[PDB]
Design a protein around this ligand. Sequence first.
Ligand SMILES: [Zn+2]
Ligand SMILES: [Zn+2]
Length: 72
Amino acid sequence: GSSGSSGCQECKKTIMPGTRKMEYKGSSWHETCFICHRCQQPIGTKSFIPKDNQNFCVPCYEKQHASGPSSG
Ligand SMILES: [Zn+2]
Ligand SMILES: [Zn+2]
């Protein structure tokens, strides 16, 4: 609301100051809402490759930019 000048992007909800959030480019994402785009899992705080407008883990991202001309 007022006290908390923060907000989520996924569920566009008010991220309380108590829970953990992922601040990326001014925007924020609930510790969960920040799940992966491939495995759809809550990466959280670990080795992960943040995509321009998405998020992919190490094993997931690699697949996106790995030997594989087939996509669609
Ligand atoms: Zn959210
Ligand atoms: Zn993943």
